[PDB]
Design an enzyme around this catalytic site. Structure first.
Site, PDB file in Angstrom:
ATOM      1  N   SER A  64       0.836  -1.189   0.000  1.00 28.93           N
ATOM      2  CA  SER A  64       0.000   0.000   0.000  1.00 28.93           C
ATOM      3  C   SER A  64       0.885   1.259   0.000  1.00 28.93           C
ATOM      4  O   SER A  64       1.911   1.300  -0.690  1.00 28.93           O
ATOM      5  CB  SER A  64      -0.953  -0.034   1.207  1.00 28.93           C
ATOM      6  OG  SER A  64      -1.771   1.115   1.222  1.00 28.93           O
TER       7      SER A  64
ATOM      8  N   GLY B  83     -16.496 -12.013  -1.729  1.00 27.36           N
ATOM      9  CA  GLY B  83     -15.291 -12.349  -0.979  1.00 27.36           C
ATOM     10  C   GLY B  83     -14.445 -11.135  -0.633  1.00 27.36           C
ATOM     11  O   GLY B  83     -13.568 -11.215   0.240  1.00 27.36           O
TER      12      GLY B  83
ATOM     13  N   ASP C 211      -8.978  -2.738  -6.075  1.00 24.56           N
ATOM     14  CA  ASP C 211      -8.877  -3.828  -5.089  1.00 24.56           C
ATOM     15  C   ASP C 211      -9.634  -3.481  -3.815  1.00 24.56           C
ATOM     16  O   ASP C 211      -9.421  -4.080  -2.756  1.00 24.56           O
ATOM     17  CB  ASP C 211      -7.414  -4.154  -4.749  1.00 24.56           C
ATOM     18  CG  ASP C 211      -6.715  -3.039  -3.994  1.00 24.56           C
ATOM     19  OD1 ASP C 211      -7.369  -2.018  -3.685  1.00 24.56           O
ATOM     20  OD2 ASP C 211      -5.552  -3.252  -3.575  1.00 24.56           O
TER      21      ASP C 211
ATOM     22  N   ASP D  57      -7.857  -8.918  -2.844  1.00 23.98           N
ATOM     23  CA  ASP D  57      -8.121  -7.530  -2.436  1.00 23.98           C
ATOM     24  C   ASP D  57      -7.057  -6.917  -1.534  1.00 23.98           C
ATOM     25  O   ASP D  57      -6.069  -7.572  -1.200  1.00 23.98           O
ATOM     26  CB  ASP D  57      -9.551  -7.306  -1.897  1.00 23.98           C
ATOM     27  CG  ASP D  57      -9.737  -7.721  -0.428  1.00 23.98           C
ATOM     28  OD1 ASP D  57      -8.826  -7.520   0.403  1.00 23.98           O
ATOM     29  OD2 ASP D  57     -10.907  -7.975  -0.049  1.00 23.98           O
ATOM     30  N   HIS D  58      -7.167  -5.605  -1.334  1.00 23.77           N
ATOM     31  CA  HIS D  58      -6.154  -4.815  -0.621  1.00 23.77           C
ATOM     32  C   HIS D  58      -5.738  -5.443   0.705  1.00 23.77           C
ATOM     33  O   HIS D  58      -4.585  -5.301   1.125  1.00 23.77           O
ATOM     34  CB  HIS D  58      -6.675  -3.390  -0.362  1.00 23.77           C
ATOM     35  CG  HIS D  58      -5.588  -2.366  -0.211  1.00 23.77           C
ATOM     36  ND1 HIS D  58      -4.773  -1.988  -1.257  1.00 23.77           N
ATOM     37  CD2 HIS D  58      -5.188  -1.633   0.862  1.00 23.77           C
ATOM     38  CE1 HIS D  58      -3.940  -1.043  -0.843  1.00 23.77           C
ATOM     39  NE2 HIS D  58      -4.100  -0.892   0.461  1.00 23.77           N
TER      40      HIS D  58
ATOM     41  N   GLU E 223      -6.731  -8.749   1.687  1.00 22.99           N
ATOM     42  CA  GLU E 223      -6.459 -10.170   1.520  1.00 22.99           C
ATOM     43  C   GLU E 223      -4.984 -10.418   1.269  1.00 22.99           C
ATOM     44  O   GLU E 223      -4.448 -11.447   1.668  1.00 22.99           O
ATOM     45  CB  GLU E 223      -7.277 -10.748   0.369  1.00 22.99           C
ATOM     46  CG  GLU E 223      -8.776 -10.813   0.681  1.00 22.99           C
ATOM     47  CD  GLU E 223      -9.576 -11.317  -0.505  1.00 22.99           C
ATOM     48  OE1 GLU E 223      -9.096 -11.151  -1.650  1.00 22.99           O
ATOM     49  OE2 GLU E 223     -10.702 -11.855  -0.295  1.00 22.99           O
TER      50      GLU E 223
ATOM     51  N   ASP F 101      -7.752  -9.922   5.669  1.00 21.68           N
ATOM     52  CA  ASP F 101      -9.032 -10.537   5.303  1.00 21.68           C
ATOM     53  C   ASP F 101      -8.774 -11.933   4.743  1.00 21.68           C
ATOM     54  O   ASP F 101      -7.855 -12.117   3.943  1.00 21.68           O
ATOM     55  CB  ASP F 101      -9.728  -9.670   4.243  1.00 21.68           C
ATOM     56  CG  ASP F 101     -11.139 -10.137   3.939  1.00 21.68           C
ATOM     57  OD1 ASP F 101     -12.008 -10.016   4.828  1.00 21.68           O
ATOM     58  OD2 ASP F 101     -11.365 -10.623   2.811  1.00 21.68           O
ATOM     59  N   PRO F 102      -9.628 -12.918   5.091  1.00 24.28           N
ATOM     60  CA  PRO F 102      -9.354 -14.262   4.576  1.00 24.28           C
ATOM     61  C   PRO F 102      -9.601 -14.391   3.085  1.00 24.28           C
ATOM     62  O   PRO F 102     -10.397 -13.639   2.512  1.00 24.28           O
ATOM     63  CB  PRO F 102     -10.325 -15.164   5.358  1.00 24.28           C
ATOM     64  CG  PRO F 102     -11.369 -14.259   5.896  1.00 24.28           C
ATOM     65  CD  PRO F 102     -10.720 -12.900   6.080  1.00 24.28           C
TER      66      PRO F 102
HETATM   67 CA    CA Z   1     -12.089 -12.393   1.481  1.00 25.42          CA
HETATM   68 CL    CL Z   2      -8.289 -17.753   4.396  1.00 18.12          CL
END
Ligand code: CA
Ligand code: CL
Ligand code: CL
Ligand code: ZN
Length: 386
Positions: free
Chosen positions: A111, A284, A315, A355-356, A358, A363-364
Site C-alpha cells: 500500500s 469475498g 482492489d 483484495d487490498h 487479503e 481478510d481471509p
Molecule cells: Ca475475502
Molecule cells: Cl483464508
C-alpha cells in the site's frame, strides 16, 4: 539460485503496527498467520518496520532510516520549519546498524509503504538539496540521510501501492469513511473502537505533532481528535500523498535509482458491468471495502484529473492502474516481467485477483495461497544479482 544475502524488511501502509502491538495480531499475515515468521523459518531473514501510519511519506522515511541504522529520528530542519512539527522524534537502537557498514536490504512494502520505500531510496542515494542548503544557511546539523551517497537498498517490492494515488481520497465524506476503515481494521484484529483501552494497543506514532491517545480514551474519541489535527488537515500527511494530486507531486522528485531493483504487484477484486462500464466488488471482498469504498472507486470519473475508465478496476482501496509503478509525473520506466529482474526500472509482476487486505492476510481468502506467494517472492529477491 541465491545471489545475495540482503535482509528482507517489511513495511506497511496507511494502517500498520509493530509485532507486539494489536495484541500480537500481525499486519503482515493477519488472520492467516505471521509472514515474517514464515520467511525466517524458511531461511529468508526478515524484519518488520513500524512507522507512523497516517504520517507523510517523508516523515515515515526519516523514521524508517533511524529504525534501521539507529539514532534519533530527524525530519530535517527545513522540513520541520515548513510544516510546524518537531524536528526530532523517537530514538532507536537500530535493527541493522551494519547498514552503515556495507549491509543491504530488500524492502517489501504494502500500500502506501511503497511510496515510503521509493522515497527512502531517493533520499539515501541523493539526499535533499533543500535540507543541505538550509543547514548551511542556518548553521544547524544535518542528518546523514540528507547527504546523499548512501546505497543500502538493493530492492523495493511494492504490493497494491498507489504509485499514482487512489481516487478514494476524492470521495465526499472521505474523512469519516477513512477513519471508519481504520476501525474496520481494528475490528479484524478483535480490537473494539468504543473500548477505553489503557494499554497502547495501536500507537499512531505522532510524537512530532504532539498527538497521542490518552490511556482510557477510546479509538472512537481519539479518531475524532485526529480528524481535526494537522495529521489530517496539513499537506504533510499520508492523506495528501495518497491523493492523485499528491502522488503526482511525489513522483516528480522520487525517481527510480539505477542501483535498485523495483518489483511491482497489483491487485484487483472487481467485475465490470457490461452496460455501465463501471467496476463492482466481487464476492469475498472484505465487507467494509465492498460496501463503503469499492462502489465509488469503480464508478468515479474525472476528466480534469485524467480519471477515465482505466481507473475503475480496483482492489477495494486503490485503483489497479495506479499500482504497477509511478506514471503520473514520473520518468520511471516500467517493463513487464520477462523472467529476468532488472535494476533501475519497475519490473511489473502483473495483477493478482486478491483484495487490498487479503494480500496481507488481514481478510481471509482461502483460494489465495498467501504463504506460497511470499515464499516465492523471497526466493526471487534472494536471486537478485548485486
Ligand atoms: Ca475475502
Ligand atoms: Cl483464508
Ligand atoms: Cl487529488
Ligand atoms: Zn513532516
Amino acid at each position: 539460485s541465491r545471489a545475495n544475502d540482503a535482509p528482507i524488511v517489511l513495511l506497511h501502509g496507511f494502517t500498520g503496527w509493530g509485532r507486539e502491538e494489536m495484541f500480537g495480531f500481525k499486519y503482515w499475515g493477519g488472520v492467516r498467520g505471521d509472514i515474517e515468521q514464515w520467511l525466517n523459518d524458511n531461511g529468508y531473514r526478515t524484519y518488520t518496520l513500524a512507522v507512523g501510519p497516517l504520517s507523510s511519506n517523508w516523515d515515515r522515511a526519516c523514521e524508517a532510516y533511524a529504525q534501521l541504522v539507529g539514532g534519533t529520528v530527524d525530519y530535517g530542519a527545513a522540513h520541520a520549519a515548513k510544516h510546524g512539527h518537531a524536528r526530532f522524534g523517537r530514538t532507536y537502537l537500530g535493527l541493522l546498524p551494519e547498514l552503515k557498514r556495507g549491509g543491504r536490504i530488500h524492502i517489501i512494502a504494502h500500500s502506501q509503504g511503497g511510496q515510503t520505500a521509493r522515497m527512502l531510496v531517493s533520499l539515501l542515494e541523493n539526499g535533499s538539496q533543500e535540507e543541505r542548503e538550509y543547514a548551511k544557511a542556518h548553521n544547524v546539523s544535518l542528518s546523514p540521510l540528507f547527504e546523499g551517497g548512501h546505497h543500502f537498498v538493493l530492492s523495493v517490492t511494492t504490493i497494491a501501492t498507489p504509485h499514482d494515488g487512489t481516487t478514494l481520497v476524492n470521495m465526499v465524506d472521505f474523512t469519516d469513511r477513512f477513519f471508519d476503515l481504520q476501525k474496520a481494521v481494528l475490528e479484524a484484529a478483535a480490537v473494539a473502537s468504543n473500548v477505553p483501552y489503557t494499554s497502547q494497543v495501536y500507537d499512531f506514532k505522532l510524537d512530532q505533532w504532539g498527538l497521542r491517545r490518552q490511556p482510557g480514551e477510546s479509538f472512537d474519541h481519539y479518531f475524532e481528535r485526529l480528524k481535526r489535527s494537522p495529521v489530517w488537515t496539513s499537506t504533510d500527511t499520508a492523506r495528501y500523498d495518497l491523493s492523485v494530486s499528491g502522488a503526482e507531486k511525489l513522483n516528480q522528485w522520487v525517481q527510480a535509482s539505477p542501483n535498485t531493483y523495483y518489483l511491482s504487484f497489483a491487485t484487483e477484486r472487481t467485475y465490470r458491468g457490461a452496460l455501465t462500464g463501471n467496476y463492482y466488488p466481487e464476492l469475498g471482498m472484505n465487507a467494509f471495502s465492498a460496501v463503503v469504498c469499492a462502489p465509488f472507486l469503480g464508478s468515479y470519473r474525472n476528466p480534469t484529473l485524467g480519471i477515465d475508465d482505466r481507473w475503475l478496476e480496483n482492489d477495494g482501496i486503490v485503483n489497479t492502474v495506479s499500482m504497477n509503478g509511478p506514471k503520473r509525473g514520473s520518468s520511471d520506466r516500467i517493463v513487464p516481467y520477462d523472467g529476468a529482474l532488472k535494476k533501475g526500472v519497475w519490473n511489473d509482476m502483473g495483477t493478482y485477483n486478491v483484495d487490498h487486505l487479503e494480500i496481507i492476510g488481514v481478510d481471509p481468502n482461502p483460494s489465495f495461497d498467501i504463504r506460497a506467494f511470499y515464499l516465492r517472492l523471497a526466493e526471487q529477491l534472494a536471486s537478485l544479482q548485486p
